[PDB]
Amino acid sequence: MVEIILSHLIFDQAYFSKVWPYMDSEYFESGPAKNTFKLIKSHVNEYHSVPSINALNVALENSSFTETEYSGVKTLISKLADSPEDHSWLVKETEKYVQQRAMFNATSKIIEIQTNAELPPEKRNKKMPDVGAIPDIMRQALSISFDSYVGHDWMDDYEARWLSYMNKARKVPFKLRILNKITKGGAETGTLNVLMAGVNVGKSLGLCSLAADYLQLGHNVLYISMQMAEEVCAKRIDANMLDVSLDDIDDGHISYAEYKGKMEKWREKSTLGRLIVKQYPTGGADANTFRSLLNELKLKKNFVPTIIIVDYLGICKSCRIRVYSENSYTTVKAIAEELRALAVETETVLWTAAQVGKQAWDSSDVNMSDIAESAGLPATADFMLAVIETEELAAAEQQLIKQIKSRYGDKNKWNKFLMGVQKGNQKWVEIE
Amino acid sequence: MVEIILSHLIFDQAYFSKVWPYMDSEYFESGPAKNTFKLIKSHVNEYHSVPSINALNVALENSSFTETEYSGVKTLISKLADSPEDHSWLVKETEKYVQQRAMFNATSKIIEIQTNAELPPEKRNKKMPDVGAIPDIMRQALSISFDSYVGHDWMDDYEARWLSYMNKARKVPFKLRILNKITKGGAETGTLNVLMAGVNVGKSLGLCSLAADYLQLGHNVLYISMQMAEEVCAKRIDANMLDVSLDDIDDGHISYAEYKGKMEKWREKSTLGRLIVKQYPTGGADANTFRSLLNELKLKKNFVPTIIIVDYLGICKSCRIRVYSENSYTTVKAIAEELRALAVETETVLWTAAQVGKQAWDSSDVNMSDIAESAGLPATADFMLAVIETEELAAAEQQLIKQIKSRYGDKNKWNKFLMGVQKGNQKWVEIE
Amino acid sequence: MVEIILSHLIFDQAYFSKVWPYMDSEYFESGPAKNTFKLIKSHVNEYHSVPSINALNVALENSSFTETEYSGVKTLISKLADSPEDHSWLVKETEKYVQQRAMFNATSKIIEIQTNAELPPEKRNKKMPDVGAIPDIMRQALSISFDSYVGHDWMDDYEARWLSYMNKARKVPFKLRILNKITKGGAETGTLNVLMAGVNVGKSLGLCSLAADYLQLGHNVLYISMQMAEEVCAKRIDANMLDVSLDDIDDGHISYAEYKGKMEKWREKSTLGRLIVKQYPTGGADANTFRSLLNELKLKKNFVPTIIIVDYLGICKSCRIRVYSENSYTTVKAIAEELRALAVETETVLWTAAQVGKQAWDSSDVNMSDIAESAGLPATADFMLAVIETEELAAAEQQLIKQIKSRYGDKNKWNKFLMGVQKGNQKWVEIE
Amino acid sequence: MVEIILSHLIFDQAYFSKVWPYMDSEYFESGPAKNTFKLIKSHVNEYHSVPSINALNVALENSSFTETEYSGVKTLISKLADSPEDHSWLVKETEKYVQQRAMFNATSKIIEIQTNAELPPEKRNKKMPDVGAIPDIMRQALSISFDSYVGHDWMDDYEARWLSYMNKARKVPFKLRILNKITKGGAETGTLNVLMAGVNVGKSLGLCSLAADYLQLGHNVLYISMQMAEEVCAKRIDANMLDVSLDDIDDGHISYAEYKGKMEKWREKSTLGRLIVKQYPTGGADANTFRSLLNELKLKKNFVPTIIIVDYLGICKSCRIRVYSENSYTTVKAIAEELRALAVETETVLWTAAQVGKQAWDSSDVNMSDIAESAGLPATADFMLAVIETEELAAAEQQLIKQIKSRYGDKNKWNKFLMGVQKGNQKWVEIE
DNA sequence: TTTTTTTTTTTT
Ligand SMILES: Nc1ncnc2c1ncn2[C@@H]1O[C@H](COP(=O)(O)OP(=O)(O)OP(O)(O)=S)[C@@H](O)[C@H]1O
Ligand SMILES: Nc1ncnc2c1ncn2[C@@H]1O[C@H](COP(=O)(O)OP(=O)(O)OP(O)(O)=S)[C@@H](O)[C@H]1O
């Protein structure tokens, strides 16, 4: 029914107002229909009005396509004529036609991706998406229903807004009291929280301590280590949970009986979730890789995480920018934005680590301007905490956590407090 | 390869154990292959054992099909032979075949769903799923593999992680008591270890001493040199091992009797490894060149290294970044990441050296901020030591090895420790 | 004998382990044999084992091949069969076949090289080697035997190392005993030696004196002067060797009989080499230019230098770097690395010059931190020297040398030795 | 080409004496060309003189030739003319022909060697060289050049070098006795010479003066100005040459009659050169635009300069630096290198100006350390005169010339000298 | 040819 759609795009102002915002060039044909719609779209972009038959003929004469295409477009334009119709049958039929064409294009692209990925490398016609984003494309084929959400009205829609304040399902409480106090109830789902410490100051000890604390509070935690292996992170978690020093495990001061007893005692407790550690090579995982990991975890292991942790965003690969194409600023900003998009998609608290510049190392204070790889990371991150350690603090078994970007509350209040990091047990303890 | 799959299902046993749970009748065909697999599955369900060829013939006789296909099935079971193929290739090829067939089935299913949706509701099939199920089932076809483990589970896999604590399987001792003490068992496999010092301060001296100590502990050590050539390194090793000064070699104070006698005395030891010294042009070798070198070392001789000593990573080239496309920071970070990836792939301890800045060449203390080239090298490294030499230290044949970074222990317990350095013998001795 | 080679690759473990590491795809043909070897090589790379017939004709042959290629590969794979042949005749015949194919490929390559170079520019197919490097390709093709020579085994190659020690077949002695007692026999072959003096302090008087000494020692010397003309240097050499003041050759106090006669005196001496002087514009000569000059000298003048003296390292250009960089650190380091690579490739002692920092001007002592252009140059140099004659040594015709970096020995043993400069004769004399 | 070669062997003397030693029978053909050269070689041997074309015909008349050869030889002899080609093109073309024929013969010989090598050992030719001789044979093909001049060969070019010292082939006098005294006969070709303008001491006045003394000595001078127009610079030149004060021209004291009379008086003198003034915008002239200007002047104006004077080094731009700066050190160092490269490649004396440090401005004495361009100009400059002005020197109409860097001669011989600067006529006169 | 981030280096 392409002829009817074009005719009522021309000879119906009411029809054009609703269907146009959604009409696209890939929904008609590879011949006369697409060319006619391209003519109409160019005229609309140039004059912001629906062209007439004379305007279409003039644009057709000032066009460069061949004789066959010219004749087809001329016949199609000559066949366009308004008919007595009703707005509803046309809008519903157009929605059905657009949905069918979107599904057809999506399945054609799916077949193309499958037949392209099944090719020897270096001859796979790059810039074509991989099989990993096969379902997502189909998800885009179903989100076309002529029902775009205009937005949220402050006065018209306030009961629904008020039924989001006492819900509190968005906030995931910590286990430390100070972190809950500064965040006013803990971190929120669909966010990107960051730890900035430097090199060998913490920043993975803190992530492991957070993972252990969330695990004790009945949470499913997905640790993703882009550098350290799976047994080192698991060893850190074991040291945190079992209250056994990493030196004791290395020096064999803990027996198999004690280890088994502690593990079974933790297992028999109802207030304990599941922690899963996954390792990827440095620069070999992205947002799409994490989504594939999420899907295979949900299917194979029936594991649905809420506290997804990534060891370092700077070590991950952007899923949109080719490697080493853009500078550190753009690449890191894109990676952080994609991670935040993943977090809001799966509705999980995302925790990450970030390096500071060389000038901030061995300094008694770390500012937000000391971020290493990009200034956009603080802009695209919900909460950031700076971990500072000096010789005096190290001798006191304490670290100073400074609130650098506090989006859940006022950062001026409680800006710097001293945590009791214990490096042997990979644990954070409070001083209150 | 359905014939191979069926033959190794009937005959091979470990392949049957690994591949049978991930087998469905929809993966094979709609003809003789499907019928044969159905017969095998029925037999294995009746009797919990793999059938034989005579059993297959009996099942065909008692459980019959239409002769049209029955002839094709009986001629299909005439070629299944033992054919002792290797297990890894067979498993990988079967996995690829089942993944391809799953993708084909998912595409056909989504096409059928789309076709059914187009049909009017009066005559549309009821067993077919709705269009909304198209994405998820596609995901069900994306995550199909033979990997029963998707990650590391803290509570599920408490066993097989305690084994890694009893038997280290990662630690490699240092032959020096101070380094073992500050490392708690020595450097670990799949790690990048760095000695940082000023120009001609003794980066090669320390690396040669470590190589000699590893060689005395029955280790395969591969010394790759982008500079310093080859012979020069073997002379340093000879000075360390044969207890002859460098001046003696270049002044002719050692006879061929002493040299050959000491070499054969070392050869008679059963606790001696192999030391291959390889030379590459400065800036003319990368991680892939190292992988090719390892492959040719494994082929042309029975040499698989456990220690890999790269003389200086700064004078290597990245296997991803084009030459001089990026600055020092990005290139050196990429080189360090590639070297660590090589280390984790080969499960070897990779030692290397790095230069310090121009400002630290005449300083009694060297900080992590004094690293030359990238600041991401300390981030990528697993263990970094700073070699400091001053006039007072040189007057006593000693250096000031300082812990810059340590993923093996707390860097503050023994941060700075004096080490006697015999430059004539190119040897590190410990003060006792 | 391609069929026999492939058959015994598939069906012989000993033959495979003997001949596979020396196999290349450029040896068989441009038809079925090359495709079969590609399949075998891909299988061995992927699974580290020799493929079987089933793996070849099922798991691998189902790939992107045309009908003719598919038929040829099928026929060749079906024709493969194990044949009983002695495993001393097979290896020798395979080695002969490989050598013949390498020679054939080299001949075709040099024919293509000549055809390309015969064509006029703008169509000359860059990155293809010039006509000068025809003999090296043929020589490489000649030495294509199946001998395992990967690196320098420490225990297996101590005989050759001792031969190198006793022959001292790396040292090139100086004519000055002071420079021989600190270098333990002079400079080594594959080395980069540097002089740092300042502005109008030396830095070419020293290079000219070293060239004159090497000329008197029978060495072939190549003086590449980027900053000085081909004649300004020669005249300095004449002043050094003829014991005539540099001013006397300008005012005219030396008669032609003296000049020609003194020259004839040197010519009659059999311990005199060639000091060929070649000038390049300042900033217009790289390592590739020097290689072209070496090839031209070898072909035309039959001149193979043992000493290469570049008048100034910092006014050359980098062959690897394509876009000029305002950062002097990277450019000078790249130039030094390329020069040292050239030196180790040609086994020629390479002397050059470096500029000291303005702070070091009129300073009684010059440290290594006074290097001006780059801090990477001292890291790549094998031996550096500093000239620090400020004001009083000039009145006594003296120059003090500090020995800033010494890779031939301990630089703290004889740090200063107060060389006897003579600027009129442009030479160095000892203070014995 | 063979016809031309034989014709100019018969009918020329310089061509014969130049190309006969490099002429062989195998270089021509297997029919007319080779036989005809054989006749020339035969006659050149029995009678040591070039045969007459009739004598060459007499050789054909009296020689063993097959009917076809004898005819072929007669036709070729009748086809030789005494036409006059240019010598350089003839020598170059016959060299190329000889090189191509030698390469073809060597390639055919190595192919024949390889073919003979792949033959039954019992059955092969003994005279054919072994395969190992292939790389040497090609070398003999590449060692064919009518004239070998790769650089300056010491002990092989001493007679030519002496003719350079006596004839002062490189020196260009100054017309000022003091400047000739300190340069041992003037500046040299292929050099960069700069004057260190101090505190508002000067701006082009000196370079304009240098553009008059060279003009009076007969040299072609190209004055490139950036901060001035052509008319203004030529007005400064007129002031110096016509003895008219600079302000007198603007005021109008000098009339057209006197101006034209003085100009024609200068034109009558045969000891006068040509001055070409070219203007470029500030920062819009790198030392690659100057090459284009020289090419245009040579092609169109036939003006090949011996002196090139650039108004100001700082105003110039680097050919390949992209980013320019009003007063940046990196640009000045690059500009100096590019200008000196231009001087070397054009064999011209290049003069320019640069600013100095404020300390050099306040202090009457100027140190190389006290220079705006440090380690950049006193490294690429053969001569650097420090022209500074003092109120006392001003009151006496003088300027103290100090010699800060003299590659030509000893810097301390005559370092300080007083110059009679006239600021009105823009002139330098000597002081008794 | 400019523009902007980050780093590293060096010169004043
Ligand atoms: N095995 C161990 N035993 C004891 N202490 C350890 C051990 N590993 C690490 N530490 C301590 O933990 C501190 C911080 O460890 P990490 O969390 O790995 O630092 P980091 O910031 O994550 O390292 P990078 O540079 O970001 S990869 C170190 O400085 C050590 O003091
Ligand atoms: N060939 C040698 N003969 C004698 N002593 C040497 C020799 N090479 C090095 N040394 C001594 O050992 C010290 C360190 O040398 P290396 O370990 O080779 O240098 P490095 O720290 O690797 O730095 P580079 O690579 O030379 S910039 C020197 O400063 C000397 O004291």
Ligand SMILES: Nc1ncnc2c1ncn2[C@@H]1O[C@H](COP(=O)(O)OP(=O)(O)OP(O)(O)=S)[C@@H](O)[C@H]1O
């Ligand atoms: N013709 C000469 N007569 C006498 N002494 C000279 C002569 N040329 C140079 N010198 C002296 O030689 C030294 C100059 O060093 P050179 O060997 O020319 O190299 P350089 O000048 O230091 O290099 P740069 O980059 O040009 S500063 C000074 O001590 C001069 O006095």
Ligand SMILES: [Mg+2]
């Ligand atoms: Mg970390």
Ligand SMILES: [Mg+2]
């Ligand atoms: Mg080194």
Ligand SMILES: [Mg+2]
């Ligand atoms: Mg010089």
